[PDB]
């Protein structure tokens, strides 16, 4: 009980697929000392055509040029600090390398958990019933079909799922009929191929989970919102008010919930025609950004991500079949208050990621440690006369959401 | 105005009085570049000359 | 109407406008060699000179 | 405190990608017969015979 | 063990000290100078004004 060995017993560790897939090239060394705390990109232009015999354009309005923005901002600090009496800590921790191994992993895990939370908070598209898990081949291919149906081509598509879900797909693959290599691989290693249904499938064990939040009542919209392109050309966010809710409930709508508009359908963005899902049209959906309570009378004000643009003076920017007006019917996907682990699918150009270098703190010992492309600044100081040595590790990330209509959540359907 | 490089190397146990020194550095690079060689092949007084 | 104010940016140049100034007269005129290297705080806070 | 006037708000000269479409019907319908048959002399419409 | 340098301005030497507080994560700097005045003989100076 006194003699100890030197090899630390192995610990647990998550996996990294989210950081490697997001776009980390456009936003790289862009928030420097000159730009400030935020930078903004540009947006593509859309035009509309006039069909008149004789080609007389007089009187009729020519296309108006409106430019948008996509602003990225800086996040909070990822700080982990350790303090100790050097007398006891130097007893059996020489050169203090024991600290280094499990702290960078903590920093990276926290960063990727926050990244996943941001991705599922800002994503717009939704698929399937949240309760039902992923079991068959169609549950994965539907995401690729939807993404191709919208019209996104330039980039690369990805779908991320739980380890248990991968077994249910590998087990299904073991029942194939003609491919010796596929059957053999699934039987032996239980590894699904890279391209599953036309999209790049990935496995991740560390994945964020969310709570639905209690709700009740046949909700409907009370006041007609303003979804003109001039209002939402900088954020693709809009605020709506709901009526017919429960009398007084706190946490009526949590962050990440999906609200569906039944009578307003998606549009193929280029051809501006409705989207049809083989048997039924596809309705519009949006994501809650911040938690909302309910007051007396059941009036709930919520801010959503993803906007149903139906500008009537600039029709070229439409992204929904009809304008949402008063009395429309809405519903919230999922059950009352269950908690699930959502599954993510997105395009390459959905969200960005970057890190801000940190300068050396004056008159304090410092060093830089690198871990899969992330720079960590470590410092040591001896404040306090109680023989207490102190260290700290710092990291400063940056987030940006380009287009909410190129990502979201997806589940299985019965 | 003059902006000088910072190293925080010296002044380690030394008294400093002259703030009239500016630190400038020379920077060297080695690159691999594409160059076109012209072969003047005049036969008189040797032919092969690149 | 064209609303294209998001196609440009607000720019602050890296140039400093000139400021104000004073002049050095009194310091250059008085004598400094007598007191140079004659007082140190640790030793004390006063030094004495002998009158003729 | 109040270092706002030092920095500037910039907009990068990069355009984000958009949504595209595909064209399959225009390359399958007949185009050889109705190639220049409608001229200045012919008028707005031209006719073909039936078997 | 504090990062420092030396600066000059018309024959005057100034010390700069750079130090930082870790928990506050703040970088601060300071400049210092210590003068010393003497008066040899009061009967060798004064103020002159234009007499009427």
Into which percent range does the helicity of residues of chain A fall?
10-25%
What's the count of strands of chain B? Answer: 0
Alpha carbon gyration radius of chain B: 26 Å
Biggest interchain interface, per-side counts: A-D, 29 and 15 residues
Separation of the first and last Cα atoms of chain B = 48 Å
Helical run tally of chain A: 6
Which structural class matches the secondary elements of chain A? alpha+beta
Largest sheet features of chain B: none
Q: How far from one another are the termini of chain A? A: 57 Å
> If strands are numbered along the chain, what order do they take across the biggest sheet of chain A?
8-9-16-15-10-17
- Approximately how much beta-strand content do the residues of chain A carry? 25-35%
Organism (chain B): Shigella phage Sf6
Protein name (chain B): Gene 3 protein
Organism (chain D): Shigella phage Sf6
Protein name (chain D): Gene 5 protein
Short recap of the structure:
This is part of a larger assembly, with 4 copies of chain A and 1 copy of chain B (50 residues). Chain A has 414 residues and is an alpha+beta fold.
